[PDB]
Amino acid sequence: IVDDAVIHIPNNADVEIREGVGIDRHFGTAANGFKYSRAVIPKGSKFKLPLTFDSQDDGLPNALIQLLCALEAGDIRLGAAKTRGLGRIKLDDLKLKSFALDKPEGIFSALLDQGKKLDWNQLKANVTYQSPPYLGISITWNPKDPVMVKAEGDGLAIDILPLVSQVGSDVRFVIPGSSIKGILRTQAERIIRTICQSNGSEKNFLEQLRINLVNELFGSASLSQKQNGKDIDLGKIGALAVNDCFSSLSMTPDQWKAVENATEMTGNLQPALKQATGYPNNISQAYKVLQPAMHVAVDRWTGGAAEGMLYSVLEPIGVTWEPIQVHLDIARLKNYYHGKEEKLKPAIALLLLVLRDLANKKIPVGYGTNRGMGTITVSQITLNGKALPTELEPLNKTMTCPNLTDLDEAFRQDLSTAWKEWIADPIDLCQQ
């Protein structure tokens, strides 16, 4: 039995709105109609685990013990957008109360005594937690040009401000997993379409997205089709999920509200940024973290500046960022391929080619990528899979060469072979 549980949002925190856009794969710009926004419960919100179990046998089912171990491990995701940042939950303070409802001493305990405590650690000792196959990818990176995602709307002293999110007591700058997923997907598709020389220009955006291997890695929209008199769904969830990436720097919620509500770039903005950057008495260090920039459009006949075309950006030139977490669900792919681990190698080959470009500055991130922002240096990719099949076991590695040369040449040469064999015939690899 699972009850409803009310969510208690942290103190002063409130429901956040996340903006979303779909970027046309041909023009590189927002697709028409593909603008949306999502309310989200902020990170660190709590709710009660409300389970009851009515045992007809003695003891407790081991699968139900594995479930509680999985919750404590944080392996369960809840709600929407699970591949695009949202939904991870972890259990704390697990408590087990047993009522022996089969007996008078137990039935009155249910009515009066509030039950018999069990030590969870004693059950937690009698089982080995079997985590399913996955490949965790941790990319360690720093911004080479200021990296930001733009806030939802224009500011006062500063028009373009970074997106931030609540993370408990403090706000942090955030790059949503939606944004990191979307840049990775775009490069993955460009690689596939390049190999096939398949043009993207005549397709609308929902058809542009729908191409081979990426349909399994990044996932596809639900879409019923009577494909062969048989009726089939084209939709499948992404086997690849991405987390929101937060800044190492943090500010109290009011400290950032002082930045959002500054009105003079040389006036009351300067105290606010000195506060938030952590150099309340040293602006020349404050502006090595967040630096206001001014821009003009210059009229082509007169010079000077075009009437009205003056704007400013709060560039997070020096915000340091935590390592990006990508989680690849090897079990979910292997289910799509009806078990055949031979079929993983083209999908794994694609993913490693995407990561090769990320480390070679070929995938810029966030706002203004063509306009002085968004280029990242990758220092290290750590590949850490659990229960990988033995022929993929060489993935468990920490890589620092951008060109993957830290993966075994025999393994890189094996992946290249399965990849080349797919290039020679790019079938729908999950078609049994």
Partner 1 sequence: PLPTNHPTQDYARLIEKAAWREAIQNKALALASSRAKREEILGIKIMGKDSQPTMTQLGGFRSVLKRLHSRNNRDIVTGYLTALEQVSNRKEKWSNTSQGLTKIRNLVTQENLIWNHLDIDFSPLTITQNGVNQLKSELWAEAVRTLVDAIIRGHKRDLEKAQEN
Partner RNA sequence: ACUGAAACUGUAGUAGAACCAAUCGGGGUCGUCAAUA
Partner RNA sequence: UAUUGACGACCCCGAUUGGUUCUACUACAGUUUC
Reference 76, options 84, 65, 85, 67; nearest CA is 67
Cβ–Cβ under 8 Å, residues 366 and 179: yes
61's tokens: 């089912």
Binds 212: which of RNA, Mg ion, partner 1, none (CB < 5-8 Å by kind) = none
Q: 159 to 188, contacts with Mg ion by CB under 5 A?
A: 159
Binds 423: which of partner 1, Mg ion, RNA, none (CB < 5-8 Å by kind) = none
Q: 88 to 147, contacts with RNA by CB under 7 A?
A: none
Q: What angle do CA 17, 23, 25 make, to 5 degrees?
A: 160
Cβ–Cβ under 8 Å, residues 361 and 376: yes
Helices marked H in 249-398: 253-260, 269-276, 283-286, 330-336, 344-359
Q: Which is nearer to partner 1, 303 or 308 (CB)?
A: 308
3-state secondary structure 409-422: HHHHHHHHHHHHHH
Minimum distance from residue 308 beta carbon to partner 1 (Å)? 5
Minimum distance from residue 412 beta carbon to RNA (Å)? 27
Q: Which is nearer to partner 1, 57 or 307 (CB)?
A: 307
Q: In this chain, which of 7, 17, 223, 234 binds partner 1, going by CB under 8 A?
A: 17
Q: 249 to 308, contacts with partner 1 by CB under 8 A?
A: 307-308
Kindly state whether residue 155 participates in binding Mg ion, applying the rule CB under 5 A: no
Kindly state whether residue 31 participates in binding RNA, applying the rule CB under 7 A: yes
Q: 284 to 323, contacts with Mg ion by CB under 5 A?
A: 311
Q: Which is nearer to partner 1, 16 or 145 (CB)?
A: 16
Q: In this chain, which of 60, 76, 96, 156 binds partner 1, going by CB under 8 A?
A: 156
Residues pairing with 167 in the sheet: 43, 170
Please give the Cα distance from 102 to 97 (Å, whole number): 15
Q: Determine how many CB atoms are found less than 10 A away from the CB of residue 101.
A: 11
Q: Residues with Cβ < 8 Å from 397, sequence gap 6 or more?
A: 382, 383, 406, 407
Minimum distance from residue 427 beta carbon to RNA (Å)? 21
Q: 5 to 24, contacts with RNA by CB under 7 A?
A: 19-23
Q: Which is nearer to RNA, 15 or 306 (CB)?
A: 306
Q: In this chain, which of 105, 113, 154, 409 binds partner 1, going by CB under 8 A?
A: 154
List the binding residues for Mg(2+). 159, 310
Q: In this chain, which of 13, 161, 174, 181 binds RNA, going by CB under 7 A?
A: 181
In angstroms, the Cα distances linking 266 to 206, 263, 283, 292, 347 are 46, 9, 11, 10, 52
Minimum distance from residue 262 beta carbon to Mg ion (Å)? 10
Q: 370 to 399, contacts with partner 1 by CB under 8 A?
A: none
| Pairing assessment for the beta strands 30-40 and 16-23 based on DSSP bridges | antiparallel
225's tokens: 């089709």
163's tokens: 């997106």
Kindly state whether residue 120 participates in binding Mg ion, applying the rule CB under 5 A: no
Footprint of Mg ion (CB under 5 A):
159, 311
Footprint of partner 1 (CB under 8 A):
17, 152-154, 156, 307-308
